[PDB]
Structure formats: structure tokens, C-alpha cells
């Protein structure tokens, strides 16, 4: 075996008593160990930083080894051989030199941490060795280590600046951070093992409950009063459905996608906020203040053209909440329809071709034309959007204000009790974390269609066609029925699809038909 060099030793320190924001850092704090809380906006690729360098003198063949390097690349000051006076002609050897892994992870303060909403202060966090690829861009993380100052390499020779050392040249200092430790602050059996024993017991009890479906539907949006159909649709979407692809190659979408249209002051945006909070790997945004192409994908030049992660990727493998969908561009809606059933977002600009899986569930909230839902107006065209997209959408919820005095008094009392008692007013059947665990278990489950379930789906599709007797119902409606049946089987914890589940799916589709 080859002779073994001395192993590099890394020392990581965690659970520091205090954590400071990027804005909290100061030039006086440099040179001391510190823990910083923030979100990693970007992470540099892992690189072999020249931690130790080995040079060979061309004049006398004398060789140096493992020379320490400053911020700039360095060479031996004098030839190791006393006879040779060489100070140049140093040729590096990759094998004799030792390189540590290198990765710079840009970070920024939390936007919520900023009091006035101002731009968060950004800090450069250096990840090396095991710290490289120990965090992900866009994920909040706490970094512990010594704050550092980066001199100008051009001033070194490789605003105010120090001079007279550099010599005549001024030297400007760039603050940075080196993180000794990195911590991220942001099958059914495998999920059960990941769950603690108490969590497994609670999930088992909830799954054993026969009213689990209705209980979850009620638990959706505890603060919101009414909109039980929207709650059931949200629960079905979060549960999801099994993906399937035909032998001919056509691939159906397993994720449920819905679009909600209703009058203002119906808390559709509140439902979107609750869904975004509940769904892992989810991103919420307002449609009016957004860029259509930027949401789907991003492209930028990196120090050469590169590809930046899009907003839709933040929602990948999870629900995507869309607020002010009517205010958003119909071009963006058509783009979503283009990347809804086929998914597979791709880039062809800047000369670089990139691919994106774009696998996510879509939820939307919108104000119908005229500022309020019109029952006389058809379900299609109340919110201007592509007809194939409307067909591919699993459901189209309708929200209408109820003039009933009892409902008005109930909503008023619920809002007043909320304002008085904070979270105590809400009484969801299940806790948010328990419902999330149930959703994960149901996602681990893959419902299977029964033969009686298939016959029931046939009958329900025939009934939907009779209701068309055209544009409202289609084979896409049948696909939505299958997806909702899978979601209902997941919610009821039944292993296989049932005719009753298909009946519930048809009932939800008929409610969308209105």
C-alpha cells in the first residue's frame, strides 16, 4: 500500500450560546468565533483550494512540499537547497500538494428578521472540507466560525484603502465569514421509523379513526369558517395521488391541481397561506407582483452563462400556492398549463440548454370578473384562462356570499373570538403537525383501483357526460375523478380505491360543475 500522509484534522463547534444576524456582524467581531443565523442565497461549487502547495525549482530540481497559501496563491520565498538561489520557476505538483475542498455559500439575513422590510445584509460563508455541500441554497441555516476579512487580490498583486505597507497601492478589505460548523435552521415503514414512538401512536390512532376523512377536512383552515368544499379539495391535493404512465408512453399527472374563483373577502388568500405553511417544499407568492417566466425558471450569467433555480422549483414535490391569480397574467396562466400536465420545464436561451422536472401541485385564488362571482355566468370564462387548462384542472371551486343571518352572525362571532383569543378560538379536529404526518403516511400509501371502483368510475364518467348534455366534462374530468379517488382513499386510509371514494370524487367534481 502507498505511504499514508498525515490526515487533515477538522474541529467543528456547535450550539454556540449566541447567534447574530448578518446585520449584527461588525468589523470588530472579525477574528472571533461567532454563530450567524441567515438563509443561504447561493452556494459555490466544491473546489480544491490549495491548502498545501508543493513546488519544484527548475534550476536545481529542488522541491518544496505542502507550502501554506495565503488568500492569494503563493510560492516558496527561497529555494530549499542552500546552494541554489532560486526564488522563481516554482512548478506545482498536484499529488505532492494537498488541496482541501472549497465552497463559498452566500447568505443573507431573514426577510422576516429585517424590521423595516429593508434589504437583508448579505454575508459570504466559506464552506470547506465536510462543510462543502453541507447546506442548500434557499434554505435557512446557522453557521458557526470565525469572521474573516478578504483583502483585494489585485492590490496584493497575486473607498479608503490601507497603504504604505502593497507599498504605494491601497488595499480595500472585504468582510467575509468562515463557518467551522454548518447547521440548517430552515415507504410507510420508513416514515414510521422516522416518526417518534409517540408520533407513530398518534398517527396510528388518527388512521384508525373511521371519520379520519371528515376530521381532516374539518381540520383544514381552522381559522376559516365555511368553505368546506375548498378544505376538502385542499386536503385531497395535499394527500395527492398515485402517478401512472401508459404503455404507449403517455404519462398522467399524479399531483392534484386546483383553481379557485370567488368574490373578495372570502379568505381564499388565507387558505393559500395556510396551505403554503402546511405543505413541505412549497412557495407562496402574489400573482400581480411577479414575473411569469421568472416563476417557472431563471437564467443568469455566473463568473459564463448559467441557470438559476426558478420559483416553481421551490414548490417542487409539494403544493404551489398562487394568490391574485386573476390579477396574474393570462400568459402566465397559459404557461402554467403548458408546464402542468407535461411538466418538464426547459431552458433554451443564452446558448445553454437546461431541464427542470417541474413536479408540483398548483393552488390558486382569484377574483371573478366583475369583482364578485356571478352564478348566471358560466363556470368557464368567469376567470379568463385557457380551456385545456380548465379541463386539466381537477376542480373549479365557486365561492358565493351567503346572506343568511345565521351564517353572518356565525362568521362575525368566529372573527370576533379569533381577534379576542388568538389561536384559542380555532378548534381543528387535528393538529397541523399530526395532519402533516398523516399526509406523509398517505403519500407513502399508493391507492389501487378496484374492479368495482372501475365500474363505478365508468358510471360516474357517464353521469358527467350526461351533465354535459359539453366543454365542462371530458376525459380530463375522468382523470381528475381517478386522482380524487386516490386522494380520498389516502384520506380514509383505505389501501385501495373504493366505489364510495369514486362517488365522493364525482360529488366534488359536480360541486365544481355547480
Amino acid at each position: 500500500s502507498p505511504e499514508q500522509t498525515e490526515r487533515v484534522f477538522q474541529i467543528s463547534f456547535f450550539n454556540l450560546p449566541t447567534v447574530h444576524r448578518i446585520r449584527d456582524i461588525r468589523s470588530e467581531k472579525i477574528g472571533s468565533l461567532l454563530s450567524i443565523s441567515g438563509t443561504v442565497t447561493r452556494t459555490s461549487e466544491v473546489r480544491p483550494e490549495l491548502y498545501k502547495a508543493s513546488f519544484t525549482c527548475d534550476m536545481c530540481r529542488a522541491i518544496v512540499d505542502n507550502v501554506e497559501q495565503s488568500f492569494k496563491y503563493t510560492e516558496p520565498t527561497f529555494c530549499p537547497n542552500p546552494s541554489c538561489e532560486n526564488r522563481a520557476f516554482w512548478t506545482l505538483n498536484v499529488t505532492r500538494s494537498r488541496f482541501l475542498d472549497w465552497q463559498k455559500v452566500r447568505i443573507q439575513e431573514n426577510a422576516n428578521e429585517i424590521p423595516t422590510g429593508s434589504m437583508p445584509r448579505t454575508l459570504d460563508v466559506i464552506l470547506r472540507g465536510d462543510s462543502v455541500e453541507r447546506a442548500k441554497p434557499g434554505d435557512r441555516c446557522k453557521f458557526t466560525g470565525v469572521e474573516i476579512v478578504v483583502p483585494d487580490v489585485t492590490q496584493l498583486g497575486l473607498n479608503s484603502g490601507v497603504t504604505g505597507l502593497l507599498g504605494v497601492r491601497d488595499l480595500t478589505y472585504k468582510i467575509s465569514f468562515l463557518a467551522c460548523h454548518v447547521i440548517s435552521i430552515g415507504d410507510q415503514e420508513v416514515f414510521l421509523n422516522s416518526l417518534s414512538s409517540d408520533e407513530i401512536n398518534e398517527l396510528k390512532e388518527m388512521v384508525k379513526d373511521e371519520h379520519i376523512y371528515d376530521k381532516l377536512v374539518r381540520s383544514i383552515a381552522p381559522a376559516v369558517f365555511g368553505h368546506e368544499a375548498v378544505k376538502k379539495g385542499i386536503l385531497l391535493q395535499m394527500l395527492g395521488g398515485v402517478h401512472k404512465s401508459t404503455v404507449e408512453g403517455i404519462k398522467l399527472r399524479g399531483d392534484i391541481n386546483i383553481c379557485v374563483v370567488g368574490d373578495p373577502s372570502t379568505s381564499k388568500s388565507q387558505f393559500l397561506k395556510y396551505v403554503v405553511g402546511f405543505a413541505p417544499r412549497s412557495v407562496y407568492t402574489s400573482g400581480k407582483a411577479s414575473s411569469a417566466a421568472g416563476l417557472t425558471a431563471a437564467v443568469v450569467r455566473d463568473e459564463d452563462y448559467t441557470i438559476e433555480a426558478g420559483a416553481l422549483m421551490l414548490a417542487d414535490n409539494g403544493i404551489c400556492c398562487i394568490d391574485e391569480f386573476d390579477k396574474m397574467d393570462i400568459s402566465d396562466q397559459v404557461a402554467i398549463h403548458e408546464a402542468m400536465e407535461q411538466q418538464t420545464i426547459s431552458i433554451a436561451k443564452a446558448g445553454i440548454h437546461a431541464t427542470l422536472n417541474a413536479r408540483t401541485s398548483i393552488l390558486a385564488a382569484a377574483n371573478p370578473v366583475g369583482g364578485r362571482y356571478n352564478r348566471k355566468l358560466s363556470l368557464r370564462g368567469n376567470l379568463n384562462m385557457t380551456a385545456p387548462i380548465m379541463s386539466r384542472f381537477d376542480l373549479f371551486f365557486v365561492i358565493l356570499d351567503d346572506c343568511n343571518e345565521k351564517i353572518d352572525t356565525e362568521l362575525a362571532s368566529h372573527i370576533v373570538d379569533l381577534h379576542m383569543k388568538r389561536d384559542e378560538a380555532i378548534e381543528p379536529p387535528f393538529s397541523a403537525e399530526q395532519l402533516r404526518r398523516y399526509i406523509k403516511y398517505a403519500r407513502t400509501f399508493k391507492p389501487i383501483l378496484t374492479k368495482e371502483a372501475r365500474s363505478y368510475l365508468v358510471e360516474k364518467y357517464k353521469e358527467l357526460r350526461k351533465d354535459d348534455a359539453s366543454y365542462r366534462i371530458t376525459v380530463r374530468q375522468l382523470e381528475s375523478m381517478i386522482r380524487l379517488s386516490e386522494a380520498i382513499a389516502r384520506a380514509n386510509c383505505v389501501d385501495e380505491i373504493t366505489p364510495s371514494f369514486i362517488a365522493e370524487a364525482y360529488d366534488l367534481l359536480r360541486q365544481s360543475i355547480i
Partner: protein, 617 residues
Amino acid sequence: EELTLESLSNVKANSYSEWITQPNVSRTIARELKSFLLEYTDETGRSVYGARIRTLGEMNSESLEVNYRHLAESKAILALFLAKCPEEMLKIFDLVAMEATELHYPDYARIHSEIHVRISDFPTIYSLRELRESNLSSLVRVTGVVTRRTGVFPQLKYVKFNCLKCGSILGPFFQDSNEEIRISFCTNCKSKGPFRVNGEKTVYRNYQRVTLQEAPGTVPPGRLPRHREVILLADLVDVSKPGEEVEVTGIYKNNYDGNLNAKNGFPVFATIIEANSIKRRFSWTEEEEREFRKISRDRGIIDKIISSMAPSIYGHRDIKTAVACSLFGGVPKNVSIRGDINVLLLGDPGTAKSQILKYVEKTAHRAVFATGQGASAVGLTASVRKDEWTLEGGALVLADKGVCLIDEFDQDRTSIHEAMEQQSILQARCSIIAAANPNGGRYNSTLPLAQNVSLTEPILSRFDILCVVRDLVDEEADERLATFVVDSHVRSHPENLQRQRKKEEEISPIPQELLMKYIHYARTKIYPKLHQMDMDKVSRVYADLRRESISTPITVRHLESILRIAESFAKMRLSEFVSSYDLDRAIKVVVDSFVDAQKVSVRRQLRRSFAIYTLGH
């Protein structure tokens, strides 16, 4: 001296590369490499490397190929030494491979100046994210889709130099391409001097580098893949193309870059894999031709092919027959007749005409699918981008000799129509199959096809067949569609290859791959020949069809399409000579196209007048 292989098994050095570098161990390694090429034994007993040498002689290849697994099977010590120091093992291996190939074939060195061993079937593959600085300077396999492929360019394998102050002579320094030769010294005098390139001893080799990047599945979902460049060795150039998945066995290596250090804020070296070898990830067979002739029938083969066509689609059997005729195609004619057979499908949403077009995309040898909203005329013509400037071929140009696809029939319609009049989209060189919704909505019987889809009357005449479908709700039809769809969902579902057979449920009598290969065989191995008597009857029928079009049009282009569709029916029967029934069914297809045009307006009168004309037999 030469050490024993058992003595070489222990590295006995600071590194395994140093062990290989030690001259006695290097001579022993060369002897062991020749002995290993001789020692690897095939099931026949001939050396696998010896058979590779015979194949290299027959191919006149400049580079020998040696499987890494074969080196593990025999001289596993040499294999491990290569895993540690692939270049150190591979230089001696290349010398040994040249010696073996020359021993097999005299003057093989005169044929090839240098024979280089190439790895094959490398054992372990590492992802780019899994690849690290420790992986650098050692051979590794990488599976990923190339981000881009640079074109092959001339490069100096070695470069002699001239010192301006000294004599105009220097050693032919080999160029590893990891960095500039950068001798930083004069050969004639031991001091720094200008080094103008000298061609007296310069060696020249083709060079190409294709950046390697992880596949989107290889990267975690929602995460952009890491990219590490892959370098093609000389004679390994142009092995891969941009955007192509490949598994490359290459030594990862890091090279210092000042700009990289400036961007990182710390000294750093750019990492690029250098492939010692590359292993990158529809024609009818002859046995397939025999089986296709056996399965084909003199009569009813068109019915079997129509049942096989559009297996995903339910109903639309006429559309299936038209698409089958277009896919079978016809022999080209040059002096009016076009070899390609054009098909058009129109129907309300849910007609699955687009599904039939997708099946046709599989059926055609090099099909390209496009839609009117999805593809512009100029965009489908070509794409232009900076390379320097370079051009990209259009989609219609990409689909050649295999039936092309069109949808949403208006820039794409201009590309189609300019193609139909021009015979050029750049020639489309492909049959046209249309799956267009009528007026962007559910089909209405009152609208003639020209109104339902904007097009040219000459385009309708040029189409070998035109199809129109009207939406309707029937109880039996709903039951059939529901049974087929539920069966398709169960088939696609994981719970339900024998399971794949029960999943297919014999929806198509002819398997789709076998039918596409049979259409290709009936287009290439079989060349349909129009029958003269059937053609005389068809010419009388074409005169009658023009007269009937005047009565209630029909064109010589439609008659030529009848000849081409007769060739297509002969292909469906795999007959070198077009049958009279083939010509009759082709006249029926052209008559169906004429009836489909202005359907509600003229279809009843056309059917009454053409009951005798549609089929000669």
C-alpha cells in the same frame, strides 16, 4: 532488472503512481501487461485481447481497447495499479498493446504511429456531486448528460519551440492540454527565453472537450446538476454530442485558474474529467422482414394494420387507416407525384387524433411532432445562435423520410403549405400527418373542413386523405371508452412483461414496434410498383372523380396521391407490386379526402356518384 508481480503487489512506494514510476516495476508492469493481454481467456480459449487485436487489424484502428473488468479478471494487481494511477499504467499498456497488435499483424506500427489502450466497461461510476477533490488525479466513470460538446479542433500533441536568444531548437514537449506547455526555459540555454512554436518536431492530434453534467434525475429534484467537463482523447473526439447522456471513464483532474481564485476569494483549481474512453448511453431487421412477410396477408392486412394503428385511440378507425397509409408511404416520383402520403385528422377534443399522431411519431423512422401554437414557421425552418455563429436544423428538416407530424392546423400552416407547394418546408422530405381541432373548438358538422381548419384547397388536394370526426354521446360508446380507459389505467398502474401483455390486452393486433419496423421494411426492402391495368382503371376513375368534383374538388395531385396510397397499401401487404385492390383502396382514400373536404356540403352526392368509383374492384 524487473520485479516479480508478487513483489509489485505491495506498493512499496509513497504512492502507487510512484510504484509504477519506479523503472524496475515499470518494466515488470509492461511485461505483466503483455502477459495479461495474453492471459485473459475467452470461452473459446483465445485471448480476449488477442481477438481485440485481430479486430483492430481488420478495423485499422489506431487505438487498442482493453476492458477494465478484463484487467481485474487477469492481472488484477495491474488493474488496481491502474485504478490508482491510470496514466502510469496506461502508458506501458499502450506500448504493450502496440507490441501485441504488431506481433499479430506485421507493419501495424507502420499503419498506426502510436497505439493507445482504451478502457472498457469500467466498474465504478461516480456522480459529479459525488465527485470530489479526492477523486481528482484518478480514473473514474461519470454518467451524465453533456451540457455542451465543443467541436473537434486541431491541437498539438507535441510542440517543438525556438529560443530567440538561443538557437531555434527545443524538445518536442508533449501537450497534456491541462495547461499550456509553459516550459518557461530555453532548451539551448539554461535560462528563460522566448519560445516561438517550432513545427520541426511538433506532433498534431485532434482534440475535443464535451462538458459533462448530471442528469436532472441524477441531481436531486429541484436542484441544478453539477457539471464537470469531460475531455475526449485523440481518436476519441466527436464520440459524443451536446445534450447527450453518456458514461465516460476518465481521470478527474484539477487545474489552477486565477479568475476562479478571484471569484472564489481563495486559491482554487478548476476541475475537468479527461476521458481515457467514452461509453455513450428503428431500422427493420432481416428476421423482422421475414416475420413481417409471414404476418402480412394478401387481403385484410390493411385491416390488421388499421387495428394496430392508434392503439391508444378508441374508435376513429378511418383515421387509423388514413394514418397507416401515410406511414406506409409511397415511392417518390420526379420529372408530379410525391412519394410522401399526407394524412389529415379533424375532430372535437377527446377524439385522440393527437394520440394517433403520437403513435405515428413512434411509427415513423425520424418523426417530428409539432403544433400550430407550438412551432413557428421560421422556428421550425431553422434556429440560429452564436457558436462565432452557428445554425441549428429545423424540426421539419430533422424529420426526414419518416412521416412528419403537424397539429392545430397559422405560421405552422405556412410551413406546411409552403412545403406542399414548394416540396420544400429546405425540403420537408417527410409525410405530413395532421391532428387539428376544428376552429379551436368542438367539431361542428355544418362547417366545411376548409372553414374548420384554415388551409389551402391545393393542400387538401395534396393530402392523400382527409378525416373529419364529429363529437357525439352514445351510451354504448361511453361504456366502451370507460372500459378501455379503466383497463388502460389498470394496465399503467404498478399493481398490474407478462403483466405488460395482460396490460396491453391485445388492443392492437400487430405490436407497435413490429408494425413500425414492418412499415419501414415495406418502404425500403419492398418498393411498391404500380400495376398497369389497375392504373388504367384508376385513370378512368380519376377523370370520373374530376367530373364528379365539378358536379359537386379532385386534382391530378389527388390522382398522384392515389398512386402513392396504392404504394402504401402494397407496403401494408408488403408486396413489391401494387395490388389492384391496393389501387382501389387508394382511390377510396382519395375519395374520402374529397368527401371530407366540404363534408356536409358535398359528401352525400360524392358518395352516391363514387359508389362505383371509390373501389375499382
